[PDB]
Amino acid sequence: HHHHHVREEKLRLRKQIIEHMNSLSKERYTTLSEQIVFSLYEQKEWAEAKTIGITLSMENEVNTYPIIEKAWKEGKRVVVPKCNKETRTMSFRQISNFDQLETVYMNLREPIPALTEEVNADEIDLQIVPGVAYTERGERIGYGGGYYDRYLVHYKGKTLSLAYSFQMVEHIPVEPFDKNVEKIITEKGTMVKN
Ligand SMILES: Nc1ncnc2c1ncn2[C@@H]1O[C@H](COP(=O)(O)OP(=O)(O)O)[C@@H](O)[C@H]1O
Ligand SMILES: [Mg+2]
């Protein structure tokens, strides 16, 4: 229960799940990503959202590119974050096409400020929240920046996360600032806060 025990457990779990994700075959990535998103589009909060906030997936993370395409097809407004590393804040900005993105390093894609419009949190109906590991309780370990933990303080709309079932864990050592998500969709079903 010492502070280091907590931080070391988070790094340990983050490391272990990332390693597992990276080991996923191409077949598993493709099939599981397909299943998870098919289940997303059946959700009431998808159908009803007129503006959706989402991240651009990397490596073997559940594939969000098809989700953005579907949202565009359905006439939904799509917003993606630009992170400010100094303030640890996110500016969700609308994208109508993938040419409004730039690579802000190696594999990390963000909306080009000059070509995109910031959208206020109170205008975003659903936030699809990225992450590394989760519990049945909606608890969440991300990548270590604490961006969503900070953002979710002021965001009052609906939240959900997409996850492979192996990203589900029994216990996460949550700190007072860790924010939970309302729903998790895996290839096996959904975990909901009631
Ligand atoms: N609401 C907040 N206000 C201030 N600092 C925060 C807040 N939320 C998270 N942090 C900080 O962000 C850092 C990373 O958060 P952490 O929970 O460890 O990562 P993650 O949520 O990405 O898995 C921690 O050092 C923590 O102090
Ligand atoms: Mg956290």
Backbone dihedral region for residue 147 (phi beyond 0: left; psi -120 to 50: alpha; all else: beta): alpha
Q: Which ligand is nearest to the CA of 177?
A: 1
Residues touching ligand 1 (Cβ under 6 Å) are 10, 141-146, 149-150, 153, 177-178
Q: Where are the domains of the chain?
A: 1-194
The Cα–Cα gap between 139 and 181 comes to: 7
Measured CA angle at 130 (ends 37, 9), to 5 deg? 125
Cα dihedral sign, 97-100-101-102: positive
The Cα–Cα gap between 137 and 20 comes to: 22
The Cα–Cα gap between 83 and 128 comes to: 16
> Using the 8-state DSSP alphabet, how is residue 168 labeled?
B
188, 164 contact by CB (below 8 A): no
- Say how many C-beta atoms besides its own lie within 10 A of residue 77's C-beta: 19
DSSP SS3 for 3: helix
How close is the Cα of 154 to the center of ligand 1, in Å? Answer: 15
- Pairing type for strands 183-186 and 189-192 reads antiparallel
Cα dihedral sign, 88-106-159-28: negative
Experimental method: X-ray
Q: How far is CA 153 from CA 105, 106, 146, in A?
A: 27, 30, 11
Q: Where are the alpha helices (DSSP H) in the chain?
A: 3-23, 26-41, 44-48, 65-73, 147-151
E strand or H helix at 178, and its extent? Answer: none
User: Measured from the CA of 175, which atom of ligand 1 is nearest?
Assistant: 17
Backbone dihedral region for residue 109 (phi beyond 0: left; psi -120 to 50: alpha; all else: beta): beta
Residues written for the chain: 194
> Can you read off the two tokens belonging to residue 102?
């730039």
Extract the runs of DSSP E, i.e. beta strands, from the chain: 51-53, 77-84, 89-94, 101-105, 108-111, 126-128, 133-134, 140-141, 158-162, 183-186, 189-192
How close is the Cα of 103 to the center of ligand 1, in Å? Answer: 25
Q: Which residues contact 157 (CB under 8 A, 6 or more apart)?
A: 121, 122, 124, 125, 126, 127
180, 139 contact by CB (below 8 A): yes
Q: Which residues contact 119 (CB under 8 A, 6 or more apart)?
A: 51, 53, 77, 79, 92, 93, 94
- In terms of CATH, what superfamily is 1-194? NagB/RpiA/CoA transferase-like (3.40.50.10420)
- Pairing type for strands 108-111 and 101-105 reads antiparallel
